[PDB]
Design an enzyme around this catalytic site. Structure first.
Site, PDB file in Angstrom:
ATOM      1  N   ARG A 189      29.109  34.024  -9.026  1.00 40.54           N
ATOM      2  CA  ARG A 189      27.777  33.689  -9.777  1.00 40.54           C
ATOM      3  C   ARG A 189      26.884  33.309  -8.553  1.00 40.54           C
ATOM      4  O   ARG A 189      27.227  33.172  -7.394  1.00 40.54           O
ATOM      5  CB  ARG A 189      27.933  32.402 -10.529  1.00 40.54           C
ATOM      6  CG  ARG A 189      28.209  31.066  -9.873  1.00 40.54           C
ATOM      7  CD  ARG A 189      28.374  29.631 -10.869  1.00 40.54           C
ATOM      8  NE  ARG A 189      28.571  28.800  -9.763  1.00 40.54           N
ATOM      9  CZ  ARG A 189      28.687  27.538 -10.490  1.00 40.54           C
ATOM     10  NH1 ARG A 189      28.308  27.131 -11.745  1.00 40.54           N
ATOM     11  NH2 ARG A 189      28.841  26.473  -9.650  1.00 40.54           N
ATOM     12  N   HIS A 217      19.835  27.191 -12.449  1.00 36.59           N
ATOM     13  CA  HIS A 217      20.638  28.249 -13.106  1.00 36.59           C
ATOM     14  C   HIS A 217      19.834  29.791 -12.806  1.00 36.59           C
ATOM     15  O   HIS A 217      18.610  29.735 -13.385  1.00 36.59           O
ATOM     16  CB  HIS A 217      20.966  27.854 -14.550  1.00 36.59           C
ATOM     17  CG  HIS A 217      21.652  26.545 -14.473  1.00 36.59           C
ATOM     18  ND1 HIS A 217      22.971  26.480 -13.948  1.00 36.59           N
ATOM     19  CD2 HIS A 217      21.144  25.270 -15.064  1.00 36.59           C
ATOM     20  CE1 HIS A 217      23.312  25.287 -14.298  1.00 36.59           C
ATOM     21  NE2 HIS A 217      22.451  24.679 -14.745  1.00 36.59           N
ATOM     22  N   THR A 257      -3.829  -5.775   0.534  1.00 34.98           N
ATOM     23  CA  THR A 257      -3.184  -4.152   0.871  1.00 34.98           C
ATOM     24  C   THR A 257      -4.170  -3.323   1.496  1.00 34.98           C
ATOM     25  O   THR A 257      -3.472  -2.599   2.449  1.00 34.98           O
ATOM     26  CB  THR A 257      -3.021  -3.417  -0.607  1.00 34.98           C
ATOM     27  OG1 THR A 257      -4.372  -3.242  -1.270  1.00 34.98           O
ATOM     28  CG2 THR A 257      -2.230  -4.369  -1.650  1.00 34.98           C
ATOM     29  N   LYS A 281       0.881  -1.308  -0.032  1.00 38.10           N
ATOM     30  CA  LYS A 281      -0.024  -0.066   0.056  1.00 38.10           C
ATOM     31  C   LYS A 281       1.020   1.243   0.019  1.00 38.10           C
ATOM     32  O   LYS A 281       1.898   1.400   0.687  1.00 38.10           O
ATOM     33  CB  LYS A 281      -0.934   0.018   1.335  1.00 38.10           C
ATOM     34  CG  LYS A 281      -2.397   1.026   0.989  1.00 38.10           C
ATOM     35  CD  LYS A 281      -2.967   0.289  -0.002  1.00 38.10           C
ATOM     36  CE  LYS A 281      -4.497   0.246   0.372  1.00 38.10           C
ATOM     37  NZ  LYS A 281      -5.390  -0.619  -0.555  1.00 38.10           N
ATOM     38  N   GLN A 319      30.333  20.387  -6.967  1.00 36.44           N
ATOM     39  CA  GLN A 319      31.043  18.929  -6.542  1.00 36.44           C
ATOM     40  C   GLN A 319      31.886  19.096  -5.171  1.00 36.44           C
ATOM     41  O   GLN A 319      31.817  18.391  -4.512  1.00 36.44           O
ATOM     42  CB  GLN A 319      31.894  18.388  -7.768  1.00 36.44           C
ATOM     43  CG  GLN A 319      31.182  17.774  -9.044  1.00 36.44           C
ATOM     44  CD  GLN A 319      30.778  19.033  -9.920  1.00 36.44           C
ATOM     45  OE1 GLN A 319      30.403  20.043  -9.713  1.00 36.44           O
ATOM     46  NE2 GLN A 319      30.645  18.731 -11.205  1.00 36.44           N
TER      47      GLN A 319
HETATM   48  O1  LIG Z   1      -6.072  -6.995  -6.959  1.00 37.57           O
HETATM   49  C1  LIG Z   1      -5.828  -6.871  -5.820  1.00 37.57           C
HETATM   50  N1  LIG Z   1      -4.634  -7.336  -5.294  1.00 37.57           N
HETATM   51  C2  LIG Z   1      -4.160  -6.916  -3.921  1.00 37.57           C
HETATM   52  O2  LIG Z   1      -3.146  -7.416  -3.432  1.00 37.57           O
HETATM   53  C3  LIG Z   1      -5.102  -6.454  -3.023  1.00 37.57           C
HETATM   54  N2  LIG Z   1      -5.170  -6.269  -1.903  1.00 37.57           N
HETATM   55  N3  LIG Z   1      -6.450  -5.449  -1.628  1.00 37.57           N
HETATM   56  N4  LIG Z   1      -7.190  -5.376  -2.953  1.00 37.57           N
HETATM   57  C4  LIG Z   1      -6.561  -6.232  -3.667  1.00 37.57           C
HETATM   58  N5  LIG Z   1      -6.909  -6.081  -5.118  1.00 37.57           N
HETATM   59  O1  LIG Z   2      29.180  23.639 -10.115  1.00 39.51           O
HETATM   60  C1  LIG Z   2      28.988  23.311 -11.426  1.00 39.51           C
HETATM   61  N1  LIG Z   2      29.374  22.184 -11.722  1.00 39.51           N
HETATM   62  C2  LIG Z   2      29.425  21.577 -12.882  1.00 39.51           C
HETATM   63  O2  LIG Z   2      29.628  20.377 -13.164  1.00 39.51           O
HETATM   64  C3  LIG Z   2      28.990  22.553 -14.117  1.00 39.51           C
HETATM   65  N2  LIG Z   2      28.791  22.368 -15.278  1.00 39.51           N
HETATM   66  N3  LIG Z   2      28.339  23.767 -15.598  1.00 39.51           N
HETATM   67  N4  LIG Z   2      28.289  24.443 -14.622  1.00 39.51           N
HETATM   68  C4  LIG Z   2      28.684  23.723 -13.527  1.00 39.51           C
HETATM   69  N5  LIG Z   2      28.582  24.422 -12.123  1.00 39.51           N
END
Ligand SMILES: O=c1[nH]c(=O)c2nn[nH]c2[nH]1
Ligand SMILES: O=c1[nH]c(=O)c2nn[nH]c2[nH]1
Ligand SMILES: O=c1[nH]c(=O)c2nn[nH]c2[nH]1
Ligand SMILES: O=c1[nH]c(=O)c2nn[nH]c2[nH]1
Ligand code: NA
Ligand code: NA
Ligand code: NA
Ligand code: NA
EC number: 1.7.3.3
Lengths: 295, 295, 295, 295
Positions: free
Chosen positions: C176, C256, C57, C10, C228
């Site tokens: 920058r 940017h 589920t 779920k 980096q």
């Molecule tokens: O098709 C379903 N599969 C499941 O595992 C499930 N669990 N609740 N309802 C469901 N419906």
């Molecule tokens: O910080 C940066 N790393 C990069 O790899 C890069 N490539 N263009 N500008 C950049 N600036």
């Protein structure tokens, strides 16, 4: 101080409904997101902590489900009108209901060239929407729309002859990419109430289809002088084909695709007539709006 | 301390390319988002501030555009292999390139039942993706996928016979809604280099199409005992139809639609055989994964 | 065909818990999103439609709530270990549980310089996360992280001395903007089981706090030669301050901000030493990763 | 057909500006997203493909950068008024400018209890916004707002005494969780032009601060009878503290946290006075609005 305006309700109510034809075995699904906001004699809930005037938003949610159980949910213009009318008729002190519906696509799958009876695909995030305002003694105002229709043409768009001054760097062009997300809204003449909305039911789906078709065809076929000029052509045609529409509004972003000059690298030619690779721009974007009505 | 692993590059590089047939006037567009990350003898950039080993990420961006200018961008498996190979061959000290490509849909518009020469629509947010790992002396590893394929069936899904204990409240069912967003990945046998990738070019689009078709047909036609059982059927068929695939992986959410009991309101019947209106649940969701390989 | 790997469970389980001190009146809230995926002897659910092996589920969802009711939810490393251990001990045929927890910020409000007993603010979308893998007979592996920590410095970042070739257009710079979203993960030595995790409980919050403090201080104070070089300094310090950590991984976008040349307009000077107005770029972005371990 | 309304311009223009104090070495950054839409005598661009009336949206983008270079960008009410006034004064045929600004948080870092001269953190996605409408011959209308302020209180919220009918299932409560995302807007009296806006410059930041403080304190201290009653208290206080404000509007979602009944499992008590673990609901949500003005 005084309350000048107030409205409250439930937003983001997801609803699915299935229709089963017992005769043919065919199933059809509808899925929507609904918002309902109410107005009326509710000021004291704000000013005096008087909750007796509040139809709980939780109850509004229940009502949406019950109404969907007991009524058709299509066309959405009809469902919204039923839902809004319910609140103004049921509650003496509620005088306006504002209903917004977003309809999600579930398109029937074709499997081996045959339509499947109960399997569906979400083909695009395009939506069909309605805004319904039901106001006691003033009838029903409906605005229908499509939104999220994303298109691109790779040529047959131009933009030249615009104002040039000391703020201008844009070059004139006779051949560019045009791409947009279409938001188009058509506003119906006011309806006197539910009986009148019911009388026009077939026009709702037909007008949505017309609006979509006109938008797509005009976009594809216009040798566009600008977004402004192309959008006006669209609106003009919709108004001509449905007399019950009063106005058409378009709101179109201009989603820019920029040329990339590669000449610095071994004289590579990638601009003007030689442009093949472009850089789509996420932002900024032009935004062009217009509302067209009758003479 | 020591550098155990390092990779760096440029993400979210949007690229559009247009192909123009001068003979027919027909234009075809491709749009992708590309990420390229490099590995190799670059530790000193981290540990000693030695930038001499860094191919600037800005240069990686330039290279993507130049490579797209000079080569086909389709199928994406080929483009990714060309792009990755470039970096390991051009730079002595770079020994691996990792290329991820997301392909966006631009589907040619039909206007009046005829395909339009230069107008396109984004029909759904479904993507076709590739992950290409090019490692010096170890060849080219390619994983192809589709993602964002959203489907729903309104009947012919069951779920009963699961484990029941003191943590269990879920009722067994013989008729439910099944909806998911499909993420399916097929992993190709290792390729020795670009010549071998080129030799298999026609298989890439064909296998994507097969994977899509098998997914849709199986979903629509299986009277599903569980998501687990249906997904295994899909994977089995893909492996049977393409011998050059080694494994198929599916990752499927179970997007729940809940019945709404309305019996509290005037005995309204909306559960089991009478269920018409349901509440789609945004969260939580089941998540089911499996990787299927050959005996 | 054969099942090579399978896991299911779920996802997106939202959980809130409140603790009430009856003595002081002070309340403390915790909110998380939890995912639990199980592995074990479950192949037959995929291959033979044998649901008898499936812990539903839905039941997994119930178990998360019950476990949160009966145990502390903080630190998340402890809660995740309790939750994962539950599944492998309760079910004979389940042999691994994979628990992912995202913790959301609810920071106590200060009202008039005094901490409020029961009111909280979401101060940023920064998250604290855990990934806990509980594998029968192999102990408990925990990776702790912070993510969504967004920072900017307006000077004291440089980037010069990188490789220049025919693909390079980037100018060297000695001043920058540097902005990033920090994703930092520290991996704990394997723990033998729940007793050992319990014995180290105080180290979890303290190490998160140290990781955060080292990240912020180093970013602010380093006259950065590159992303980096600065990130390596961060990782080195975290490893020095907590002996129970085996590796530290950073993944940093380079977001940017571009100079805007305004000289075309009345000779306006806005580049180099005169740069005041910049254009933040939404995409593309550099992406720099490194994993640092012990000699 | 006729053009009833039209506006166009540039949206999503990201702008960063740095101020450097040479005396102290302290740097301060501002980052905004700006939208400018123009109106005036531009109908012929839509109806006759007459681009001569169009100030290109690209030029609008340039103008935003140039204006930011030459003027203070804070308070945003002043910057927006300068920007809007520019367009109506520069272009004879443009008669209205609509400027929307979203201000993003860059809060100075504290390192070792000392404010850092040039390092900043995004502490939350809360925004400060302005909408400025500059209309030729009608002055300057300014709406200021804060949005994205997310808060929760774990007790001292009640909701009882609401309307009960056959659509109601909600139980009355004297102790619940209340959580919302605050959107608050204050509308200034109309200003005659830029000189008047300049004369009130100190009031803009002070009123934003007051609006924020009143919102937080009232939320934390009110033993809330409803969202309606608490929000009205907030609005009343803001109007009392700033005479130049005409109206205050709040729009508040009610983000629901549901009790989880665990009694089915070994009689576990988790409701009413014993409630500790709750399920946050993503949707639906209550939505409550009000506009408060002067008697
Ligand atoms: O098709 C379903 N599969 C499941 O595992 C499930 N669990 N609740 N309802 C469901 N419906
Ligand atoms: O910080 C940066 N790393 C990069 O790899 C890069 N490539 N263009 N500008 C950049 N600036
Ligand atoms: O504060 C609230 N106001 C409302 O209008 C409402 N409706 N349901 N719960 C509610 N809570
Ligand atoms: O179609 C367009 N309309 C406009 O108003 C505009 N401004 N720049 N580019 C443009 N393209
Ligand atoms: Na009424
Ligand atoms: Na190499
Ligand atoms: Na076990
Ligand atoms: Na003017």
């Amino acid at each position: 101080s005084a309350v000048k305006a107030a409205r409250y309700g439930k937003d983001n109510v997801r609803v699915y409904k299935v229709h089963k034809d017992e005769k043919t075995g065919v199933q059809t699904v509808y899925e929507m997101t609904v918002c309902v906001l109410l107005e009326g004699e509710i000021e004291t809930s704000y000013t005096k902590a008087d909750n007796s005037v509040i139809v709980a938003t939780d109850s509004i949610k229940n009502t949406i489900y019950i109404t969907a159980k007991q009524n058709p949910v299509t066309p959405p213009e009809l469902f919204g009108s039923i839902l809004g009318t319910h609140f103004i008729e049921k509650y003496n002190h509620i005088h306006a209901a504002h209903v917004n519906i977003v309809c999600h696509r579930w398109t029937r799958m074709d499997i081996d060239g045959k339509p499947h009876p109960h399997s569906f695909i979400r083909d695009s995030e395009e939506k069909r929407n309605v805004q319904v305002d039901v106001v006691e003694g003033k009838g029903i105002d409906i605005k229908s729309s499509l939104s999220g229709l994303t298109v691109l043409k790779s040529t047959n768009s131009q933009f030249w002859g615009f104002l040039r001054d000391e703020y201008t760097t844009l070059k004139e062009t006779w051949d560019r990419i045009l791409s947009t997300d279409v938001d188009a809204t058509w506003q119906w003449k006011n309806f006197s109430g539910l009986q009148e909305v019911r009388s026009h039911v077939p026009k709702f789906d037909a007008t949505w289809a017309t609006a979509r078709e006109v938008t797509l065809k005009t976009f594809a076929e216009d040798n566009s002088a600008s977004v402004q000029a192309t959008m006006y052509k669209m609106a003009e045609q919709i108004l001509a084909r449905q007399q019950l529409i009063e106005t058409v509004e378009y709101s179109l972003p201009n989603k820019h695709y920029f040329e990339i000059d590669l000449s610095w690298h071994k004289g590579l030619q990638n601009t003007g007539k030689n442009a093949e690779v472009f850089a789509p721009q996420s932002d900024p974007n032009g935004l062009i709006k217009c509302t067209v009505g009758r003479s």
